[PDB]
Amino acid sequence: LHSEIGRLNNQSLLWGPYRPNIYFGTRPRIGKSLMTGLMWGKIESYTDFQHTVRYTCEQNEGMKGYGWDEYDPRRGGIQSIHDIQNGLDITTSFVKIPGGAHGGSWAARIKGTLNDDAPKDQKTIVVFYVSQEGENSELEAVPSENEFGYEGDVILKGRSEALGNYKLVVTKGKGVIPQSDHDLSRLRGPGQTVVQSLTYPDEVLWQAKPILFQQLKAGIDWLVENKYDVADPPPPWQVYLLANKPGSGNVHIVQKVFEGDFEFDILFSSESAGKEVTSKDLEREVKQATEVFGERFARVFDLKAPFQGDNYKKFGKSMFSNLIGGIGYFYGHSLVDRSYAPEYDEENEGFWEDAAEARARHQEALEGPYELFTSIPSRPFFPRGFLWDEGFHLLPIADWDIDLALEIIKSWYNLMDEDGWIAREQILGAEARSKVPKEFQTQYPHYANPPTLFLVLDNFVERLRKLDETLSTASVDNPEVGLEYLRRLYPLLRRQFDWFRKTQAGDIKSYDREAYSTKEAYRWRGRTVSHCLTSGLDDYPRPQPPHPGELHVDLMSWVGVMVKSLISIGSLLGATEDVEFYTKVLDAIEHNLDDLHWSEKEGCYCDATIDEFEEHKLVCHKGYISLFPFLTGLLKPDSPKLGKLLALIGDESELWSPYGLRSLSKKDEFYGTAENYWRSPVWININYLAIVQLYNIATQDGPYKETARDLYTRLRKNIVETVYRNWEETGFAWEQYNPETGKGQRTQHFTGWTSLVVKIMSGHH
Numbered sequence: 001l002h003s004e005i006g007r008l009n010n011q012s013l014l015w016g017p018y019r020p021n022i023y024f025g026t027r028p029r030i031g032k033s034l035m036t037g038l039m040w041g042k043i044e045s046y047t048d049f050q051h052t053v054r055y056t057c058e059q060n061e062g063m064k065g066y067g068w069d070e071y072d073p074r075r076g077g078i079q080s081i082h083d084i085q086n087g088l089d090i091t092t093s094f095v096k097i098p099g100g101a102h103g104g105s106w107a108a109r110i111k112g113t114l115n116d117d118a119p120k121d122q123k124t125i126v127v128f129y130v131s132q133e134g135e136n137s138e139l140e141a142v143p144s145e146n147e148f149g150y151e152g153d154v155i156l157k158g159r160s161e162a163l164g165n166y167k168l169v170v171t172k173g174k175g176v177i178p179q180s181d182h183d184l185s186r187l188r189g190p191g192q193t194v195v196q197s198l199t200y201p202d203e204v205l206w207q208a209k210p211i212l213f214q215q216l217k218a219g220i221d222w223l224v225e226n227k228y229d230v231a232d233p234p235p236p237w238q239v240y241l242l243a244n245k246p247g248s249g250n251v252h253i254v255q256k257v258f259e260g261d262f263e264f265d266i267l268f269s270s271e272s273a274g275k276e277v278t279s280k281d282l283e284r285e286v287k288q289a290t291e292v293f294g295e296r297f298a299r300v301f302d303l304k305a306p307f308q309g310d311n312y313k314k315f316g317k318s319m320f321s322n323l324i325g326g327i328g329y330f331y332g333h334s335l336v337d338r339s340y341a342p343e344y345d346e347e348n349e350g351f352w353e354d355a356a357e358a359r360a361r362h363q364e365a366l367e368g369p370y371e372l373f374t375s376i377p378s379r380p381f382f383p384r385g386f387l388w389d390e391g392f393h394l395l396p397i398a399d400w401d402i403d404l405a406l407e408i409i410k411s412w413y414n415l416m417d418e419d420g421w422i423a424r425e426q427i428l429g430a431e432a433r434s435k436v437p438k439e440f441q442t443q444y445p446h447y448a449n450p451p452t453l454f455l456v457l458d459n460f461v462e463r464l465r466k467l468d469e470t471l472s473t474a475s476v477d478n479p480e481v482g483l484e485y486l487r488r489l490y491p492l493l494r495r496q497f498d499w500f501r502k503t504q505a506g507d508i509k510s511y512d513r514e515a516y517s518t519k520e521a522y523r524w525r526g527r528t529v530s531h532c533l534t535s536g537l538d539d540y541p542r543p544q545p546p547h548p549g550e551l552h553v554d555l556m557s558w559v560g561v562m563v564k565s566l567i568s569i570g571s572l573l574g575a576t577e578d579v580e581f582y583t584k585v586l587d588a589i590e591h592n593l594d595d596l597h598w599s600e601k602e603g604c605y606c607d608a609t610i611d612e613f614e615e616h617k618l619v620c621h622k623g624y625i626s627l628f629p630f631l632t633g634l635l636k637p638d639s640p641k642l643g644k645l646l647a648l649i650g651d652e653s654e655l656w657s658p659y660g661l662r663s664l665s666k667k668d669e670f671y672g673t674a675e676n677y678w679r680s681p682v683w684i685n686i687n688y689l690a691i692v693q694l695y696n697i698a699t700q701d702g703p704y705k706e707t708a709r710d711l712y713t714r715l716r717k718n719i720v721e722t723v724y725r726n727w728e729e730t731g732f733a734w735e736q737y738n739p740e741t742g743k744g745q746r747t748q749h750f751t752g753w754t755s756l757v758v759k760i761m762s763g764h765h
């Protein structure tokens with residue numbers, strides 16, 4: 001039955017628009033297989049199309065906005081793109097039609113509407129690019145009746161082991177196709193849909209823009225050779241129309257030119273399924289998917305007061321749809337330094353210089369290949385897997401579709417090496433690498449990241465203890481299935497726990513340090529004078545100078561998060577010996593958080609160093625770090641320390657802004673200093689943790705119940721309204737918010753953990 005649910009989930013999630021790095025494209029969850037991508041651009045001149053053409057996601061003054069209006073990876077959805085440079089409002093509807101043995105069928109409609117500022121007679125080039133990787137697989141464009149191109153549909157017939165037999169149809173579409181009266185029309189036709197079928201080595205098929213442009217350039221070269229010149233030139237849109245040459249190949253370029261508005265369909269028909277997919281099927285399955293998206297949203301994200309209004313419902317649907325719509329499938333080699341240089345042990349003073357020297361050895365090499373199915377922080381800026389971000393992404397996704405979230409967790413833990421390391425940043429294949437400067441590609445097996453995926457597992461365990469619709473919850477509805485998932489994952493969780501304790505260990509014993517436990521002490525590896533990238537809080541101020549005796553209170557709290565999860569999951573599997581050990585470790589972290597990290601002087605938790613004179617010094621920078629044992633759910637509801645932290649959270653002169661909690665106190669010496677990334681701005685992921693812990697205390701007998709209720713009510717309101725006001729004004733989710741102005745700043749399209757706002761609105765934790 002577990003095995004049977006797994007096969008149904010594989011068949012359900014196989015196809016998607018799983019290329020979030022590009023405006024629109026499809027691929028299945030198979031490394032070497034069939035991939036599609038859309039390109040478009042206005043052409044007004046002989047040289048402009050190279051600058052107007054769109055393919056990979058960006059955000060600049062030329063693009064108003066874009067994103068999913070609705071999306072469920074089992075059904076598909078609808079994306080809107082508002083392009084100022086090309087004067088076009090585009091819609092891309094994608095739908096999946098189950099059937100057959102090869103992951104079903106799918107269809108897409110591309111609709112382009114000129115905006116009010118566009119010339120009514122604008123010429124727009126549209127390209128559908130198709131590639132297929134694999135040794136024993138075939139793809140062939142059926143040639144047209146006509147001499148120079150297609151009057152009707154383009155049919156590609158292909159086959160592979162993975163997909164069996166299939167046809168992919170690009171329909172004629174609706175819209176004016178311009179006609180050239182030039183002499184050239186005798187040899188190239190007056191204007192029509194054309195296909196070029198080509199072959200390149202499999203590993204470069206992803207480079208769709210340069211491949212297209214090499215063909216356009218060959219066509220212009222042919223014009224120069226055959227005496228078409230500036231004495232009497234063809235129109236630009238005809239200069240940039242490829243000569244029809246359909247055939248067999250691993251690359252197929254389908255090109256159309258439209259004058260004014262256009263639409264056309266893509267129909268992928270799996271032969272092993274029922275009848276072939278039609279344009280009438282597409283229209284029906286699109287209407288049905290919207291209905292089902294609507295019904296599910298209302299059950300799962302039931303927005304509570306004061307956000308019950310239709311304005312907040314539209315905001316919620318947009319934040320949620322962009323988060324789940326970033327889900328990608330990535331496949332390829334990773335760049336990893338596997339030297340394990342001893343300098344990476346960071347055991348001396350000045351360890352950052354020694355570790356620089358080791359990095360300048362450049363022993364990193366490509367390894368894999370690996371696959372990953374995951375959500376991403378940002379399509380235009382960060383279109384790849386980040387380890388602690390994915391913990392935040394999956395909290396709303398798990399509400400939507402717990403079986404989807406378990407699949408993404410399973411995908412992440414299948415990356416873990418023998419030692420228990422998962423790289424914090426997954427850059428899988430040349431396409432993923434193309435977006436990342438060579439300097440920032442290399443992963444280091446001594447770099448951790450917060451284990452925020454354990455938070456999702458906690459939500460699953462609580463849900464466990466208490467057909468697309470059926471599959472989305474099969475792993476909770478069928479307890480046997482839930483447990484077997486956990487039985488299989490449990491060892492890898494344990495391995496990661498053991499990896500943190502071997503690789504991220506702090507030094508109690510070699511210094512004048514007294515504490516309950518000799519064992520429980522943690523220090524993040526990887527830290528430089530100005531930075532600690534592995535914590536997630538890049539430039540949050542830490543002990544200066546960095547020092548092998550440092551202890552980090554956030555890291556100890558994350559280790560607490562893991563033990564608590566291992567206790568729950570261990571108990572469930574009856575792993576008795578393990579639970580006795582975890583229980584003793586938890587007890588020890590509870591005591592040692594107080595003995596090593598609590599400051600009575602300052603009334604909060606603090607990181608620690610070793611003095612010029614070799615004694616334990618607390619270093620207190622009031623901010624997110626200061627709250628960490630509260631944020632990770634480690635403090636008893638009656639704790640006096642909790643009460644002092646509630647005082648710090650509520651204090652306007654420290655953390656509390658009208659727009660949410662500040663990353664750093666206005667009182668701290670390092671407020672608004674240097675790059676100011678984590679040194680003042682409001683971050684929705686840490687606000688989300690504070691909101692959930694306040695609510696926990698608010699719905700429980702104890703002394704701070706009513707303090708918590710007031711702070712919960714106001715913080716939820718402030719965070720939601722800040723993200724909402726910015727969305728209404730700009731159309732974007734932002735990376736962080738300015739605590740003086742409330743303005744979104746840094747990166748747009750951050751969906752991204754900013755989409756936690758949908759869970760904050762829906763409440764009832």
Ligand SMILES: N#Cc1cc(NCc2cccc(CN3C[C@H](O)[C@@H](O)[C@H](O)[C@H]3CO)c2)cc(C2=COCCO2)c1
Pocket residue numbers: 377381382386388389536537538675677746747
């Ligand atoms: N100004 C400032 C600023 C800082 C950076 N820093 C490097 C960096 C590298 C990868 C991802 C991230 C995003 N966050 C950083 C979060 O702190 C971390 O916790 C989280 O996991 C990751 C993933 O969401 C930042 C980059 C950029 C810039 C890069 O390329 C496009 C244009 O903007 C601007």
